[PDB]
Amino acid sequence: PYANQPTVRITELTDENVKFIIENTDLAVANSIRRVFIAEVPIIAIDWVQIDANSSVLHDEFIAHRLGLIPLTSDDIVDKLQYSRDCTCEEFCPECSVEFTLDVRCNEDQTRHVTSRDLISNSPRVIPVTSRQDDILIVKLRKGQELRLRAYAKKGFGKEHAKWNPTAGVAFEYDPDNALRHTVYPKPEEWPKSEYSELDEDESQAPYDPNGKPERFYYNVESCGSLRPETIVLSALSGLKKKLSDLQTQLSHEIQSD
Amino acid sequence: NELIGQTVRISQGPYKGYIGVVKDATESTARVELHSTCQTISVDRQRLTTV
Amino acid sequence: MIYICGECHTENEIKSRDPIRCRECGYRIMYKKRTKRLVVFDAR
Amino acid sequence: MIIPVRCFTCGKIVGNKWEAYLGLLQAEYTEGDALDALGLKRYCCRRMLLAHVDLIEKLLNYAPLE
Amino acid sequence: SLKQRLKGKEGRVRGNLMGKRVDFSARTVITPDPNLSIDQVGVPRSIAANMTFAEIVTPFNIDRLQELVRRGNSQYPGAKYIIRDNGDRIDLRFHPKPSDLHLQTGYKVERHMCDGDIVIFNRQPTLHKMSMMGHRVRILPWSTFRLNLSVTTPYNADFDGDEMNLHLPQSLETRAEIQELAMVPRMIVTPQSNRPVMGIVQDTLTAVRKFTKRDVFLERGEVMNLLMFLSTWDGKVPQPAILKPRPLWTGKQIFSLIIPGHINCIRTHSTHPDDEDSGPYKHISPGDTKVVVENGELIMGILCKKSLGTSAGSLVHISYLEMGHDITRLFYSNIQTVINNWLLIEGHTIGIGDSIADSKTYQDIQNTIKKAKQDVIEVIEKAH
Amino acid sequence: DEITPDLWQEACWIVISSYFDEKGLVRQQ
Amino acid sequence: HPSMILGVCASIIPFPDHNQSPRNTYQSAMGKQAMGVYITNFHVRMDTLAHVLYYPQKPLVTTRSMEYLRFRELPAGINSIVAIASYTGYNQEDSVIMNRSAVDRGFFRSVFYRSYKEQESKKGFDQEEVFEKPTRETCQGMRHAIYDKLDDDGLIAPGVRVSGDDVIIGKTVTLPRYTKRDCSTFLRTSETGIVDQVMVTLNQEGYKFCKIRVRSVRIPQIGDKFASRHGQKGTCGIQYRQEDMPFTCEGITPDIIINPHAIPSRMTIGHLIECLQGKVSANKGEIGDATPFNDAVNVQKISNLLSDYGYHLRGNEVLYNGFTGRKITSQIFIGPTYYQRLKHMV
Amino acid sequence: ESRGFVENSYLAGLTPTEFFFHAMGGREGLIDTAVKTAETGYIQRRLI
Amino acid sequence: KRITTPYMTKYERARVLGTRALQIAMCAPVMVELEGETDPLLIAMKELKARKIPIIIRRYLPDGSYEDWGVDELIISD
Amino acid sequence: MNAPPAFESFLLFEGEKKITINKDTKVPNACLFTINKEDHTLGNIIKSQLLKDPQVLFAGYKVPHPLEHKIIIRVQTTPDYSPQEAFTNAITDLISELSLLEERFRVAIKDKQEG
Amino acid sequence: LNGLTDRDLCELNECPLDPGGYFIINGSEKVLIAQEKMATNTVYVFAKKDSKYAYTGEC
RNA sequence: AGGGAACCCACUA
Ligand SMILES: [Mg+2]
Ligand SMILES: [Zn+2]
Ligand SMILES: [Zn+2]
Ligand SMILES: [Zn+2]
């Protein structure tokens, strides 16, 4: 029983931002939570594109790449969605993927902006984030140019591809006054103070703490739009707990095997 | 072989959903040249369905 | 086979062993249409 | 050729901000004021709109083969 | 004419007899890999699946070669050809009949390149005999050759676009003589200048200078993390150089664990003062600039290129001459792996602020330059 | 009258521009 | 203006009088190998080798001669967030660590177009090359390939995915039951991609003549060559994901990490000044002026401008370890530098 | 200044005369390498 | 009456190891007991360490004469 | 061409084992846990939570190659305590701490949303 | 393409930013590299490399 | 289960 007893203080919560503070935990725990923010939080993003027609100036793999990076609202759906690899379906089904379609032809003499508003899903929950600011521009079409495609968006996390990363910016820091001397400033007076610095203006560093350890960690998790910023953190804690649970199950099997 | 030259879809395993063309096929495994990447994978034919 | 003409952009159906020339404007640079085979990309 | 959907460094959506950036620059905004008005605060996102060359406008001058 | 066929560097004798195109050779771009030993080369799977070695079938290895034959040429850890006793070939790329997949004693199986295979690895121009060395093959999943960073100094290679060649010995005799004559640990010390050809280089050199300074103290977790990368560690954490108030180990203790055997060596740091050896503090250095390794333990001194480089009498040279090529190869790999992971904690940069001097220094520079221009003007007026 | 030094740096890059509006870059060909 | 003594390729170098002169020469050599959009009408042209970057960017730090080179209209390179750090030892000896997540987001991704030309010639009555789909019993010398990729004209269609053992043009020459032999052309070995365009016409002699453009998407690999505008070339040593890269207090990870040992012997101080000026330009919204001989721009002015934006004036930032979360003890010089993807892929 | 003494640093930037003189100086190293490789290689071959 | 060196040279060690490895791969009887070894080079290495390789090195003097040294008679060094 | 698939960093293929325990004979009461398809994310937390145990004499983790996906955790404990028990206790304490953190995060989020 | 505007060049599928200055020979773009030479009609006096001539004029 | 040679030019280290 050597577990930490960490506390949470939410200092800011908007639709694209959670600034919170985790106290009384370890630096490894804080960094693993920060890494799971980027790499191990599953969202829904386009991963299968067939293109029936592409008369645009951008080639087909270009359009597929731009479709994969469009975020889709994965709230309360990616939890009840299976992985395609773990699904028993032959090709695709609502249990593991969301179907998107696009059919835009430009018949007018001005440029047609094929945006993420033109992405039509059969699931009313999983839609492009800008369709729920302008829309994410996929391609521009001249007159006589057409883009007709069918896509499937599956579930995955940022460890596989960056299009499944739910976060824009995970600001993470600790010990804002350099009390632990984890970084050593050659000229401490040359360095600007952070947002969380508790020093007056004449000071440049805290006095050195010989017995101190990293015990308070400041996060600013910014969401790209797929999940709410608090949903990213909750799913990250759940995913890290699930990874440790599966590792403990395999460890119990390995121990009882010997 | 009757599978060589036929377009094919991987239906099981970690390549599920990928579309390819069978360059070389045996009774057990088939070389599927993938449309989506720059590689030719080797996958068993029980994970393959013909489009 | 259907070949799109280079400049007038009109589809031409010609057989084999015929010279390449547009029926309408006579321009003789023609392009093949996109294939009807099933093309699939991972959105990556 | 066209504005990236994601910022390369962090992954913020910058693909829905190019036309708004051009409209703000047409409204006699400075480029820094335009980037501040679009919510691009990290300098990794600001270079995505600042340094972008919209070559797709030049590609759309040529007539389509179809 | 016939004389033109015979003469020249592109003629018959020099272009086709003294040197010629060879089978079983690969060439691609080299990239760094600090996690390999000095005698290892990272090999792409596509090169290894294409280049083959003929292994004679023996009752010791008939089952493994039968499995390789059953895998075939498509899957990588397999085989390409079966040569019988009478010498005819069975191509495994055409999925032949299973009667042709029968292996007897005395057959040969041309299996794919696997881990541990010995290769001669080469960079042009081949100026000296350390430009073609034996490496052990390690299969790594990307399209480049990979080299340890110490081995780049005998090859005169960097990673700005160098391409290197890999020749696979095709017989057991030639593989054995490459293993006994031309391996990288065997080629550490040259007969040209009786000094090592490879030393610690670049990041490992900068961070071992930063590591063995006197005021470098590592906490318990950092020491355990660094000991995770010491392959010759006996498994016991040493007593820290400071026990109270906090248990702290110095970098000299960790490098003393890195130093193999009982090496005895005396070097000097590059900033060692000239007057210190004749002063009162010659054996207790105020600046920690006299390097003393005694009983394989770094007693004192900051290590640098004068101690860990290619110079004669250095720590790696004495390590070679006292311990042997295998122990010295382990020494090189351990220095690189421990130091490059401490460098994740310490870090090393370069910036525009390291190129800027003090204002008084700039004034002194300007005064010296102005005085020099005045002196040149005075010499010009004297000569006029 | 004449170009002041503070106005000089934007002036020279004007006339250089007037060069490359006229000659271009492959004028010698 | 005294900076008019430079040529076309040396006029894109930012602060070229802060570099050693051989590095200016090396960048002038490597500015011609940088991949961007080489010409606007690249879709019509059947160039035998073409390289088009997906997202070419104009430099944040330009020179005033770059307005007349039309570099901001046809740029070759991307403004990377370069941190000059020693991270894991994979950037040593002129090597580069790129961000795998950035590369997944389209960083330095390109397409490479090949063009294959073939004439349907008629050499007398006996030799008559014909564009047709070869048949297994009519044609001698068929190369055991998939000839079903071709159409009834003997030519593949755009969109069909191909590799090195695939036929793109079916051409058979009459042999004077094998009435003809297959003289088809295939892709080059180790090449791959997707047929982008197929063009059929008549040549000067009036025979049928086809050009096939095949595109292959080149994602930046380990071993691909990347160069800054200061003669600092290097191959990609390894790619780490965004959670493995070091990060600032605001979460900014570098797109590229280069070794600190690439600077001192080479003395490319204009690289460091370009990083500083790019940081100022990105935080300000301007485009940095790096005309060679400019007394209105020096290091101290750029440093004061950078310190006005809540940064350390010398461009250093406190990075945190991506693996453990600990602060790196030495603060890292990080900023936007214009990098170029060279054609020398592995 | 006239005969090629650069009185500036790389941080301070080169004046245009100093820039051209430094280019003249640095061209010598490239020429020395490119014309010494052939003679050195021939010397090595004869020695072998 | 043998004037050559009593040490096995590195070239002699390399060739003896290669020849013995080729013989072992060609199913020659092994003169040493082996504990789960498959590679003929490791078997030849242990057989050299045990002074059990049945090979005689014939060293040629420059005048044309030769000396026959058994591998068990030479001093293995590296 | 030699690009590994993106799922190879986290998916065990057929016949691959998630965790393997090997008792090294250098020192008593020491074990090496080789965990496949894992990275620094689990290695760091397991190493730190083992370092919080007073009965653990050594706790370290390493990635032998960044191009491979394999974690080696070396755990040495006191003679009256096994490394496998230490590993199980460390994972149990990590799971309990993360569950407490998740519940307190939900409580604080509800406090911030409500007011 | 002489004197044509950007729109007229784009109608011909030609790049307005293309500077020209090259030839199209058999469909291949050929550029003429400017070959330098000694200037004509000018008297140059050199010192020959230890030959029978101490100095030599040349026109 | 593999029908080109020679020369020139450009470039890589
Ligand atoms: Mg090089
Ligand atoms: Zn399903
Ligand atoms: Zn027409
Ligand atoms: Zn960003």
Cα distance between residue G315 and residue E334, in whole Å: 34
Query: H21 in helix, strand or coil?
Result: helix
Residues A90 and A124 in one domain: yes
Question: Does residue G174 contact residue G132 with C-beta atoms inside 8 Å?
Answer: no
Which stretch of DSSP H or E encloses residue J88?
helix J83-114
Question: Does residue G21 contact residue G6 with C-beta atoms inside 8 Å?
Answer: no
C35 — contact with chain G (CB < 8 Å)? yes
User: Do the Cβ atoms of F20 and G68 come within 8 Å?
Assistant: yes
Strands G139-140 and G180-182, by their bridges, are parallel
Query: G92 in helix, strand or coil?
Result: coil
Residue E28 phi, psi dihedral angles, 5° rounding: -160, 175
Specify the DSSP class assigned to residue J6.
Answer: G
Enter the tokens of residue G200: 């059929």
Spacing, Cα G151 to ligand 3 middle (Å) = 22
Specify the DSSP class assigned to residue A225.
Answer: S
Enter the tokens of residue E58: 């023996």
CA of E14 to C1' of L7 (A): 21
CA of E182 to C1' of L5 (A): 39
Cα distance between residue G228 and residue A183, in whole Å: 29
Enter the tokens of residue A216: 């308070």
Beta carbon of G208 within 7 Å of strand L?
no
Query: J111 in helix, strand or coil?
Result: helix
Residue G172 carries which side chain, given as an amino acid letter?
T
How far CA D55 is from CA of D66, G36, G51, G66, G72, in Å, comes to 21, 11, 15, 17, 10
H34 — contact with chain G (CB < 8 Å)? no
Residue H38 phi, psi dihedral angles, 5° rounding: -70, -45
Helix axes E172-181, I40-49, angle to 10 degrees: 60
Specify the DSSP class assigned to residue A194.
Answer: -
Beta carbon of G233 within 7 Å of strand L?
yes
End-to-end CA distance of chain G: 42
**Mutation test of the interface with chain G: which of H6, H8, H9, H14, choosing the one with the most G Cβ atoms within 10 A?**
H14
Neighbouring chains to K with at least 3 Cβ pairs closer than 8 Å: D, F, G
Note if G94 is an active site residue: yes
Task: Domain count for chain A, please give it.
Answer: 2
Neighbouring chains to H with at least 3 Cβ pairs closer than 8 Å: E, G
Enter the tokens of residue E133: 């060395």
Beta bridge partners of I57: I69
Cα distance between residue I6 and residue I16, in whole Å: 16
- Quote the domain boundaries for residue I47: 1-78
End-to-end CA distance of chain F: 39
Cα distance between residue K11 and residue K19, in whole Å: 17
Strand L, nucleotides < 7 Å from a protein CB: these are: 1-2, 11-13
H48 burial via Cβ count (<10 Å: 0-12, 13-18, 19+): exposed
Task: Please list, residue by residue across G88-118, b when 16 or more beta carbons sit within 10 angstroms of its beta carbon and e when fewer do.
Answer: bbbbbbbbbbbbbbbbbbbbbbbbbbbbbeb
Cα distance between residue D64 and residue E16, in whole Å: 55
Ligand found nearest the CA of E157: 1
**Residue for token pair 């199986």:** E109
Spacing, Cα B12 to ligand 2 middle (Å) = 11
Cα distance between residue D11 and residue D18, in whole Å: 16
Residue nearest to nucleotide L2 (CA to C1'): G143
Method: cryo-EM
Task: Domain count for chain I, please give it.
Answer: 1
User: Do the Cβ atoms of A55 and D64 come within 8 Å?
Assistant: yes
Question: Does residue G242 contact residue A38 with C-beta atoms inside 8 Å?
Answer: yes
Q: Which residues contact D3 (CB under 8 A, 6 or more apart)?
A: A137, D14, D15, D17, D18, D48, D49, D52, D54
G177 burial via Cβ count (<10 Å: 0-12, 13-18, 19+): exposed
Tell me which chain F residues have a C-beta less than 8 angstroms from the C-beta of G69.
25
How far CA B42 is from CA of A55, B34, E65, E81, G143, in Å, comes to 34, 10, 20, 19, 22
Q: Which residues contact K22 (CB under 8 A, 6 or more apart)?
A: F29, K29, K30, K31, K32
| Residue that is last in its domain, among A109, A135, A162 | A162
Residue (of E272, E270, E283, E267) closest to E315 by Cα position: E267
- E77 preceded by cis ω (within 30°)? no
Question: Does residue E70 contact residue E166 with C-beta atoms inside 8 Å?
Answer: no
CA of E19 to C1' of L6 (A): 21
Residue (of E139, E141, E120) closest to E131 by Cα position: E120
How far CA J100 is from CA of A25, A249, G345, in Å, comes to 11, 20, 50
Cα distance between residue E352 and residue J29, in whole Å: 51
Question: Does residue G98 contact residue A46 with C-beta atoms inside 8 Å?
Answer: no
What does the radius of gyration of chain I's CA atoms come to, in whole angstroms? 13
Beta carbon of E381 within 7 Å of strand L?
no
| Residue that is last in its domain, among A141, A162, A183 | A162
Cα distance between residue G305 and residue G301, in whole Å: 6
Across chain E, which distance is largest between two alpha carbons, in Å? 100
Query: K45 in helix, strand or coil?
Result: strand
Q: Which residues contact I27 (CB under 8 A, 6 or more apart)?
A: E58, E59, E105, E106
Q: Which residues contact H14 (CB under 8 A, 6 or more apart)?
A: G17, G18, G293, H6, H8, H22
- Quote the domain boundaries for residue A7: 1-42+163-258
Q: Point out the annotated binding site of C for Zn(2+).
A: 5, 8, 22, 24-25, 27
A57 — contact with chain D (CB < 8 Å)? yes
A96 is in an annotated binding site: yes
How far CA E191 is from CA of E123, E188, G252, in Å, comes to 20, 10, 50
Specify the DSSP class assigned to residue I61.
Answer: P
Cα distance between residue G309 and residue A82, in whole Å: 46
Q: How far is CA K1 from the centre of its chain?
A: 21
A45 half-sphere exposure, CB direction, 13 A CA radius: 29
**Mutation test of the interface with chain J: which of G247, G323, G346, choosing the one with the most J Cβ atoms within 10 A?**
G323
Which residue of chain K comes nearest to F29, CA vs CA?
Answer: K21
Bin K21: left if φ > 0, else alpha if -120 < ψ < 50, else beta.
left
Cα distance between residue A117 and residue A130, in whole Å: 8
Question: Does residue A172 contact residue G251 with C-beta atoms inside 8 Å?
Answer: yes
- Quote the domain boundaries for residue C4: 1-44
**Residue for token pair 């130093």:** E259
Which stretch of DSSP H or E encloses residue G163?
strand G161-163
Beta bridge partners of I69: I57
CA of G175 to C1' of L3 (A): 14
Question: Are there at least 3 beta-carbon pairs closer than 8 Å between F and G?
Answer: yes
**Mutation test of the interface with chain G: which of K1, K13, K29, K31, choosing the one with the most G Cβ atoms within 10 A?**
K13
Beta bridge partners of E139: E43
Q: Which residues contact G184 (CB under 8 A, 6 or more apart)?
A: G134, G143, G147, G154, G167, G169, G170, G171, G172
Count of helix runs (H) and strand runs (E) in chain A: 3, 10
Bin A234: left if φ > 0, else alpha if -120 < ψ < 50, else beta.
alpha
Which stretch of DSSP H or E encloses residue G28?
helix G21-30
Tell me which chain G residues have a C-beta less than 8 angstroms from the C-beta of D62.
40-41, 43-44
Ligand found nearest the CA of G251: 4
Distance (Å) from the C-alpha of residue C23 to the closest C-alpha of chain A? 21
Beta carbon of E87 within 7 Å of strand L?
no
CA of K30 to C1' of L8 (A): 14
I50 — contact with chain E (CB < 8 Å)? no
Q: How many CB atoms lie within 10 A of CB G145?
A: 18
B13 — contact with chain A (CB < 8 Å)? yes
B26 — contact with chain E (CB < 8 Å)? yes
**Residue for token pair 């109608």:** K11
DSSP code per residue over G282-320: HHHS--EE--SS-TT--HHHHHHHHHTTTS-TTSEE--B
Distance (Å) from the C-alpha of residue A85 to the closest C-alpha of chain B? 5
Which stretch of DSSP H or E encloses residue F19?
helix F8-22
Tell me which chain C residues have a C-beta less than 8 angstroms from the C-beta of A54.
34
Full 3-state SS string of chain E: CHHHHHCCCCCHHHHHCCCCCCCCEEEEEEEECCCCCCCEEEECHHHHHHCEEEEECCCCCHHHHHHHHHHCCCCCCCEEEEECCCCCEEEHHHCCCCCCCCCCCCCEEEEECCCCCEEEEECCCCCCHHHEEEEEEEECCCCCEEECCCCHHHHCCCCCCCEEEEECCCCHHHHHHHHHHCECHHHCECCCCCCECCCCCHHHHHHHHHHCCCCCEECHHHHHHHHCCCCCCCCCCCCCCECCCCCEEEHHHHHHHHCCCCCCEEEECCCCCCCCCCCCCCCCCCCCCEEEEECCEEEECCCCHHHHCCCCCCHHHHHHHHHCHHHHHHHHHHHHHHHHHHHHHHCCECCHHHCCCCHHHHHHHHHHHHHHHHHHHHHHHHHC
- E169 preceded by cis ω (within 30°)? no
Residue nearest to nucleotide L3 (CA to C1'): G183
Enumerate the H helices of chain A as residue ranges: 27-39, 60-68, 229-257
Cα distance between residue E163 and residue E31, in whole Å: 9
